[PDB]
C-alpha cells in the first residue's frame, strides 16, 4: 500500500474527511490528500492572527509589550490563560503565547481586535501569498465548522505552504519568525495529535484546532534529527455536528506520511 493508499484507507475507516499536506523541505516534495479541499481551520487560524501581530511588531518595537486590558466581558468559552488576568493586562506577546500554546479564545479575540478584525487577518494571509485562507469570525463562532461553509476555512496545502513560509521561510523577519517557532514548539495542546504519530524525540511545533462536526486539526513544523524539516497539515472533519474529535486520526496520518524520516 502506497502512502496515498494508506491515507485513502485511513479516511475510509475514519467516518470523516481527511486533508493532509506534507511539505518535505529537503526537496519541496509534497504528500497531498484532499489538499486543495477547504476545511474549517478552527484554532489553527490562530497562527495567522499571531503572525499578523508579529509582522506588525517588525515595524513597532513596542508592540509586543503593549498592554491589553482583559475584562470579564472579554471572556468567551475557553479562556484558560485570559481568565487568570481579568482586571489586569496581558501584553500582545502574552496574548500570542496564550492563543497559540493554550488555544485561549479570548487571546485570539484580542489579537483579532488589535489587528482590526477578521478581515485584517485574511489580508495578512494574502500578503504572504496565501490566496486561500479566510478569517471571517471571531471566537467562538469561527469553530462552527459547518460542512461546505467557506467561513474561516483554508486548504491543507495552502496552510502548509503558509506555515512553511511563516516558520522556515520568507514571511517574517528573523526575530519574529523565531518567536513564532518558539511559540509553536511550546504548544501544550498537541500531545495526542500530530506529535503522537512521530518519533518522540523529533522536535515539533504545532497548533491544533477543533470545532463542531468533529473537526480536528493540527498544523505542524517538524524537525527530524537527521533531516530537513517537514511541514504538515492534518485536517479532519465529520458529517455530524456533534461528532467527537479524532486526534487519533491526525496522529495516524502523521505516522503514515512521515514514515520515511
Swiss-Prot record:
Protein keywords: Antibiotic resistance, Hydrolase, Plasmid, Signal
Origin superkingdom: Bacteria
This enzyme's EC code(s): 3.5.2.6
Catalytic activity reported: a beta-lactam + H2O = a substituted beta-amino acid
GO BP annotations listed: beta-lactam antibiotic catabolic process; response to antibiotic
Assembly information from the UniProt record: Monomer.
PANTHER family: BETA-LACTAMASE (PTHR35333), BETA-LACTAMASE-TYPE TRANSPEPTIDASE FOLD CONTAINING PROTEIN (PTHR35333:SF3)
Protein family per UniProt: Belongs to the class-A beta-lactamase family.
Protein name per Swiss-Prot or TrEMBL: Beta-lactamase Toho-1
Name of the coding gene: bla
Amino acid at each position: 500500500a502506497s502512502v496515498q493508499q494508506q491515507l485513502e484507507a485511513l479516511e475510509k475507516s475514519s467516518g470523516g474527511r481527511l486533508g493532509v499536506a506534507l511539505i518535505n523541505t529537503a526537496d519541496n516534495s509534497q504528500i497531498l490528500y484532499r489538499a486543495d479541499e477547504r476545511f474549517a481551520m478552527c484554532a489553527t487560524s490562530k497562527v495567522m492572527a499571531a503572525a499578523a501581530v508579529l509582522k506588525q511588531s517588525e515595524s513597532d518595537k513596542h508592540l509586543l509589550n503593549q498592554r491589553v486590558e482583559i475584562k470579564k466581558s472579554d471572556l468567551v468559552n475557553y479562556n484558560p490563560i485570559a481568565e487568570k488576568h481579568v482586571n489586569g493586562t496581558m501584553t500582545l506577546a502574552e496574548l500570542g503565547a496564550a492563543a497559540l500554546q493554550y488555544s485561549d479564545n479570548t487571546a485570539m479575540n484580542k489579537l483579532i481586535a488589535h489587528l482590526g478584525g477578521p478581515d485584517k487577518v485574511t489580508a495578512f494571509a494574502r500578503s504572504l501569498g496565501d490566496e486561500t485562507f479566510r478569517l471571517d469570525r471571531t471566537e467562538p463562532t469561527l469553530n462552527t465548522a459547518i460542512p461546505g461553509d467557506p467561513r474561516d476555512t483554508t486548504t491543507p496545502l495552502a496552510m502548509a505552504q503558509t506555515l512553511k513560509n511563516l516558520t522556515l521561510g520568507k514571511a517574517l523577519a528573523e526575530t519574529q519568525r523565531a518567536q513564532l517557532v518558539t511559540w509553536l514548539k511550546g504548544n501544550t495542546t498537541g500531545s495526542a495529535s500530530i506529535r503522537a504519530g512521530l518519533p518522540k524525540s523529533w522536535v515539533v511545533g504545532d497548533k491544533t484546532g477543533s470545532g463542531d462536526y468533529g473537526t480536528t486539526n493540527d498544523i505542524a513544523v517538524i524537525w527530524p534529527e537527521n533531516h530537513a524539516p517537514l511541514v504538515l497539515v492534518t485536517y479532519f472533519t465529520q458529517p455530524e455536528q456533534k461528532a467527537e474529535n479524532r486526534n487519533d486520526i491526525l496522529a495516524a496520518a502523521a505516522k503514515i506520511v512521515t514514515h520515511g524520516f
